[PDB]
């Protein structure tokens, strides 16, 4: 398991590269002014701080741990068998009454090493969405294409707006 945390420390150290080239013709900010009068070349590394990659790895770890499903043990120590301080429910009985939650869908940020994405759904936004696919559509992509295309004059030329809003009955 520690191989995984070693690797995921490695590639984070690889993305946040320390050495980068400098800008060529960049105008230099003033650092000091001498009242009795000269830009000076710098040391590149003039910062120190806490170990940020360790903190990010910790936080992503607890975020992953929180979102996983749970395994529920329904064993009662003295239910139908003897219960006491020395006496414990047998491991086979523990196995029989330990229910496993189904394996969930993959997280959006497994392959994103420097990103943590919240998994909670927006119920208020979901209140507006259509739940079931309507009858004439046979594929989801068809329905989302139909919804996505704008018809208003804001996004279309006047001929396009008129052909897009053609009525079916004219009397």
């Amino acid at each position: 398991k520690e191989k995984k945390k070693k690797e995921q420390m490695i590639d984070l150290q690889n993305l946040l590269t320390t050495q980068s080239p400098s800008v060529k013709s960049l105008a230099v900010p003033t650092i000091e002014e001498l009242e009795d009068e000269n830009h000076r070349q710098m040391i590149k590394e003039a910062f120190a701080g806490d170990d940020v990659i360790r903190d990010f790895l910790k936080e992503k770890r607890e975020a992953v741990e929180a979102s996983k499903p749970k395994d529920v043990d329904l064993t009662l120590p003295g239910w139908g068998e003897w219960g006491g301080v020395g006496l414990k429910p047998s491991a086979k009985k523990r196995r029989r009454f330990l229910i496993k939650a189904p394996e969930g869908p993959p997280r959006k940020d497994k392959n994103l090493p420097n990103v943590i994405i919240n998994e909670k759904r927006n119920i208020h936004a979901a209140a507006h969405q259509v739940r079931v696919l309507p009858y004439p559509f046979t594929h989801h992509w068809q329905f989302e294409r139909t919804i996505q295309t704008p018809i208003g004059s804001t996004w279309n030329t006047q001929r396009a707006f008129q052909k897009l809003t053609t009525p079916k009955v004219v009397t």
């Binding site: 984070l12 701080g49 940020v52 990659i53 420097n114 994405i117 919240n118 909670k120 927006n122």
Partner: peptide
């Protein structure tokens, strides 16, 4: 943030939408 992270927020959520590590300093 001083963590080196950028947080994405929306009024609907009580937690940030995402956190991205971008810098080795603040």
């Amino acid at each position: 943030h001083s963590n080196g992270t950028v947080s994405l927020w929306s009024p609907a959520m009580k937690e940030p939408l995402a956190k991205i590590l971008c810098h080795r300093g603040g």
